[PDB]
Write a protein that binds this ligand. Structure first.
Ligand SMILES: *C/C=C(C)/C=C/C=C(C)/C=C/C1=C(C)CCCC1(C)C
Length: 133
């Protein structure tokens, strides 16, 4: 299904550290964030997405429209300018962030009652799994 609406609680996080390191997130921030349980709140209406990523210490928000390129400044993440584009490949939602880092972006999809998120940067892949709250 393409329906990713919901409140999603993290149950698994693979190689989060390797991915953050590939983005050059500073050593001290990584120590805090690496084992936090993340919650994703996704509001999806047609192409319009509002995604909130929350944890005890860090709260992020991004809004986008599927099919519409948007320039992003990655703020409290790695502080870079990228050109972002989110599209569908079948029922996989694919984000490409063009800029300095190669292979930068993510893919999100649903299997049963679970949301899967694959984050990529350089040669690093982080895989996260969430259950619907
Ligand atoms: C569609 C799912 C998306 C866009 C989720 C993106 C998640 C992040 C950019 C997460 C960033 C971080 C936190 C919320 C705290 C943990 C460490 C960070 C900085 C990687």
């Amino acid at each position: 299904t393409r329906d990713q609406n919901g409140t999603w609680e993290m149950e698994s996080n693979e190689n989060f550290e390797g991915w953050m390191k590939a983005l050059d997130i500073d050593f001290a921030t990584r120590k805090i964030a690496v084992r936090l349980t993340l919650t994703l709140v996704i509001d999806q209406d047609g192409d319009n997405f509002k995604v909130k990523t929350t944890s005890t210490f860090y709260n992020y928000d991004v809004d986008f429209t599927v099919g519409v390129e948007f320039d992003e400044y990655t703020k409290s993440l790695d502080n870079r300018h990228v050109k972002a584009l989110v599209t569908w490949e079948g029922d996989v939602l694919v984000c490409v962030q063009k800029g300095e880092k190669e292979n930068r972006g993510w893919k999100k999809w649903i299997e049963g009652d679970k949301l899967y998120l694959e984050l990529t940067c350089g040669d690093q892949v982080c895989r996260q799994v969430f259950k619907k709250k």
